[model samples]
Target chain A: TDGIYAAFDTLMSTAGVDSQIAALAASEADAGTLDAALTQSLQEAQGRWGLGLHHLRHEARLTDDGDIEILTDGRPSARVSEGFGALAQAYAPMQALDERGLSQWAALGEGYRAPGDLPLAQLKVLIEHARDFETDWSAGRGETFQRVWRKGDTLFVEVARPASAEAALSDAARDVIASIANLAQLPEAHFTVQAFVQTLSGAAARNAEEYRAALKTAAAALEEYQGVTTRQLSEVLR
Target chain B: TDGIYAAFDTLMSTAGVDSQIAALAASEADAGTLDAALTQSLQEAQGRWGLGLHHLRHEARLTDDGDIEILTDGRPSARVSEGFGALAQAYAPMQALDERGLSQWAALGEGYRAPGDLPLAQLKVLIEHARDFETDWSAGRGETFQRVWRKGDTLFVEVARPASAEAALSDAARDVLPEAHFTVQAFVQTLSGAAARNAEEYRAALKTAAAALEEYQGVTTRQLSEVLR
Candidate 1:
């Protein structure tokens, strides 16, 4: 359950998507260009979310009422729809940036330095958001999704994969395993992206309220995890 | 050079020792007991410092003039000691804590909670100090000393052992490895006793400082290793 929770949690709060969204919101481009950028960002976000759902043995389909319902282990969990109030307003100072200004803002990612082109208040938030993504991605790569541990002089490796990984290595999880495998120089036998999705899925919430609460708690935990560099249960989980 | 610097940096800033020092400072005990407690705390601090020095392939010895000199790869780096100004004054409020009160303060370490027996101003400093130790220790175990990396479905681990690790496993660094190994069940332990016990918001403040520490550690470790090797 925690595994799937982590998967979904990571999906919603990914920094790459957030930055892209912010970048679009900040850009001084025409409506068509901004709309296209928004669409691309949404596609990537939704695509990752879909992959995570599939890996966790859940599915989402649009209902006759035009709301999306998530089915967990072949059962319905919750139906969610966006309200107009959910729309985030752009920061007045942030939206003033031109193309070159935005380019410079994006450059902070490539070079690991701070004091970017934003007010202290705004820069602080962006930097933290970026760090949150970095921490999660790193933990996911090394601690959570795929892991490494040592005994005496020998190293033991564990990997979490979507159950469908055996059928095809055609997802982000598989790519990550492949990337790590290449970097680590371990053989195929030592490395695996074998799907582990459905085996660990626990019972979803019976009602929308509990499901909403659990998801909210998970979402809030991203902020919590950002600060908690060392996981208390890391040893137990390992 | 960086290695020894880290060893010493860690030596000076250890939260366990710091807490003990603060506990001694804050206690309402008689001079005899306070003296004994301070003596014990100093012994531990010095013992850890000495072990760290040995592992880094360095040495520290008192000179004939009654001052300590640190030899780095058989050379001196810096030498000096405390002036009267370095003597820190106790907070008038802190000096009021009794034995039971001190015990309650110590219990904060056991249960993973906060709001200990200290003023906000004083508590902030202590908390930051504790967090600094935790971050360093964790990074030392996981990222610096013993490391783990992943490759497609495979977990590859890298451990940083003292060059003398082959000779003996009787030091704090070794104990850490053993503990982490036991806990993680991976062949070695990569967790540190120094841990963060605060909310997420404070992490932003820690990052700049932590990054600076990371850079310093990297630079010094490389330099120290080059010399020692």
Candidate 2:
């Protein structure tokens, strides 16, 4: 009956989280279903994958060596950070592939995966990965370049760039700049992260492939919410 | 639609868990339910947290570095390795604390995690951690006082003390010699991976003897997984 919440408390507590707070909402004696306090506690900590210490799908294993690995089953489907968690789920591996950047996975090309009950975890890892790179160019670094990446045959990434910088470079050159910028950023935490958007703004005009190639860079779940929703789950699992 | 599968694939592939083998079954186009293959892929790899490379929880993001916070939202109860996941869920933090060793976590005085889901992952990790040392000792030398480690409360290690050397120590000391032997051997069968076996068995005996240690830990998830079904 109280299995779920306790499971959660255990997870958080073990991860070096707060033992008291973890146990606080654990008891469901009051809320038969689940409580918002507990739900909100997680909600508050949730957001933007690129910002925190999280580095996996559901969770990342920290070995004795202090190195980490993404757990295959941990996915965005859980309560961590949806977009960001999804983002990390996706990117962590791409970074590991350490191939020619995202281009490495892109090289795998189309039909690389099938559907239904799959390593959905891996997909999200790289998806988040692609987005992670995309975020630097398009999201947070909106005014960085014109086009940073490629999707189909045409290039993508003309998301955000300064007016002056936008006019200075051609669509081809802008795309290249974005890719280059991605190579430049990544690997840094959100707070400490930075990129020289000016690199693109100032670079000479070049085609998308040339820019993507030269931009030189590089880088970088749960559910069981039931027991999770109450104060009782805490005691049991606590 | 395709988002979920791709996420799972990227994760498994990165983890080095075998792709074609992991994907062979997928597809919920009809069930409107979870997919078995997707579920099994995780099931197969869920045990031996340390033996393999695993460590996550229903909840992650333990950063206070100070204030010492626990993310209560992480839970099991899913199509994935729910219990073990949740169990793994808790210990990762306990792990972050880097308590005096598995034994310190055990010494919590009382309310330690029980039955179902506790250190099932930690157990495996500690088991593996212990075994890693054991392997170095017994796997090659058979009896080599490798002096495995543990934090404050006590000092641990009895693993492999050189074949002939094991016989010379006092019965009590020799008793510990055997415990060291157990650590090295536990990795062989179901001995180190099982769940519910008292962690203290492997832990306390860590400084005690080898025979009593083998009886512990011999067994051992996640979700979206709605789409996963």
Candidate 3:
């Protein structure tokens, strides 16, 4: 199951569909066919996850060295980077709220770095939210998804999906979310959520609102999920 | 001049002794020819210090990679390995004092990690000490000493002496201290002192006197000059 060719083949099949229509069509096929297709697609994904675990184990075993390894596979590799990025993006909205609240409080001149534009404080909130999000997501209260493919020498993240109400969202959202969820089943997706939270905290904050808007647009455009919440513009603004 | 080799060679010749006298002496005539032999002997001694400095700078540059580099040259590379090991060994003692002090005073503990064996705190101390030592040592401390070499690969520390009594300590201490005085003198020395303090702190009250005696033996064997003070 962790064989390399099997994983590579699975990635090839998933790479074909770029739209919800194609994803839905693929999902609507007979259960046997869908299972076969998914099985084929996930082989490489699993292999990548396996490689990532191998590397993590290696790094942990080394007592003297402190080098960080960067994994370059698709599903497993994207899992490492985007998994933390997702948690970070999730808190971006909450951090914006906290900043606005702190600034409003600071206008009265009672506040310091607490709950404000103080980057470290903002980072702490992000880290706490990430931790909470991770605990709930792992317990299956929500889901994580990713899409991957090659673009020249660099591998591009084609899409990512966070757990949403499957029944409430339109077909498009379901497709995108399902695709991401399906990809997550691969072994590489097995990231230590705690480490992910830490990495997210250390990463430099880009414009949080802009990141939220982009994810919202991608989710909305890729899926025609009816009941799914729209990406809020205020998420990026303080 | 930044010509550390010439300066070191000059000092060793004036000292008028063969560093390897224990290994080479066979007859009184061989001893009698000491002046001519002293020039050649000093040249060899000067080489060891130069080589040791070369290895130290090489290893120092490797720390920025966020990982330790494994030295490829085995036992023959003792100078480099010893320098690095000494640098690393300096941390534990300093950390013990830091933790002990931080635990006693909460005010000082602010921003310090909660009392635990967190490795990063030790690392932070090492990095901070390393930087401060580099700065002061690079700038000449007194009237005569001038910074000799300061490239990443080569560093030369030269202390100008007026040929006098108190300055003898300054001159003799120079060979042991080297050009990277901050690292060798202040930083590394503190680390060694910290280790000694840690050993003493860990000793039981009854064992304290016995432990001190054993430690003094080690200091005597190593020919460590600090004890003379």
Candidate 4:
């Protein structure tokens, strides 16, 4: 409320909350649509995940992909201009009204290139976690393929890591004593993560007694990772 | 009834023809079984082809893989004496038999390799026609292979000559007809023969070992002739 938030509030009070987001859209449409989503999402951040955003500059930009990007830290980026362009109230003085209120309005949003800081600290935590596994999953395959809509953003990653045939035997333990030995928990690295999952599944199908045993251990591991019981995972190899 | 014929009749009158073939089988069976067939075949030869044999030197042989070959001329370089042991007029004098009968039981089917000749003039005509293209057909493909069966003594020779795609157009029309004007047919060293009869029939299956001339050419000439129609 001290600087940018106080400035953003004045603009918010001028009209209904719904009408304000619409005005942002009419300016350059594309970015306006995203800013509206961002504004609404900011509320979700404060309400849902309980991450909080209290202050910042309003030099928020209308990026090509339509997301409103603003400088994160308070080092001073040149929201240095002013008014509803409030960071530098002189950018367009809010006293005269809409950044679009003037016929000479050269900025977007039929409004001004909004004023003050855009607080983003809250959105980062949620988005980074979703994007975190993206690179790791792609790298493990020894090849990377990322197509739009190919991935689901909110869930844990699932990958098929390629593994050698020999590794398959160590993975499936058929001996009676050793077979049930590690039943309580699964193995890692060479065992569970990546495409090696398929290698183990294949051993479960063919190979010998040792492989058959090794594969049971692997299936048990995947069944747990997938959260489905072994019975369900059994219908098809996990 | 006459000359050597009357003498051969006396030997024929003895022991069952079946038992004779059997003893020969035990001894040298060599020809006894075939001689039975040959005796009959000779009769058939005379009957069917009108080819007669005015002969001498009855010491001949039955060969493996099947064929009866005996020397035909008399200017002897060597008098080879050998056998697993089978037929002869007496072993050469068998009880005064088909050894031409006047033997007086000599030591061999002899007197000498009888002064005479048996050039198969007419017999050659029929068999040669069959074996003729055997070489040609194989040769036509530039290089052919006529497993020996292809050269039947009297039947048409069958060779599976492989044709170079290029050679075919060259021979089918025999002129410069590129019917290969597209020249789908190729240029090769061998063509057309019993071997080639085999080629077309072989082509009749699997597919056209033949390439269309208008196509890409000048690769290796994979010539092959299969046994024929």
Models 1 onward score TM values of 0.18, 0.18, 0.23, 0.13
Q: Relative to the unseen true structure, what is the C-alpha lDDT of residue B138 in candidate 3, on a scale of 0 to 100?
A: 21
Q: Name the candidate, 1 or 4, with the larger DockQ value.
A: 1
Enumerate the candidates' DockQ scores in order. 0.01, 0.01, 0.03, 0.00
Worst 10 residues of 4 chain A by lDDT: A144-153
Better of 2 and 4 by lDDT: 2
Give the per-residue lDDT digits (tens) of candidate 4, residues B74-132: 22111112211222211222233222211122212221111111122322221222222
* Global fold similarity of model 1 (TM-score): 0.18
Over the stretch A73-106, how does candidate 2's per-residue lDDT look in tens digits? 3432333222223434454454432221111222
lDDT values for all models: 0.28, 0.27, 0.25, 0.26
Candidate 4 residue-wise lDDT, A12-40, digit = tens: 32111122433445454575564555355
Q: Any runs in candidate 3 off by more than 4 Å, and if so which?
A: A1-6, A9-238, B1-11, B15-23, B27-141, B144-229
Which model scores highest in TM-score? 3
lDDT of 3 by residue, B94-162 (tens): 222222111121211221112222133332232221111121112223332211112222222222212
lDDT of 1: 0.28
Candidate 4 lDDT: 0.26
Candidate 4 total steric clashes:
52
DockQ of 2: 0.01
lDDT ranking of the models: 1, 2, 4, 3
Give the top-scoring candidate (DockQ): 3
Q: Across residues B127-178, which tens digit of lDDT does each residue of candidate 1 receive? A: 2222111111122333333222111222222222222222222222232221
Report i-RMS for every model.
Answer: 13.1, 16.8, 14.6, 50.2
TM-score of chain A of each: 0.21, 0.21, 0.21, 0.17
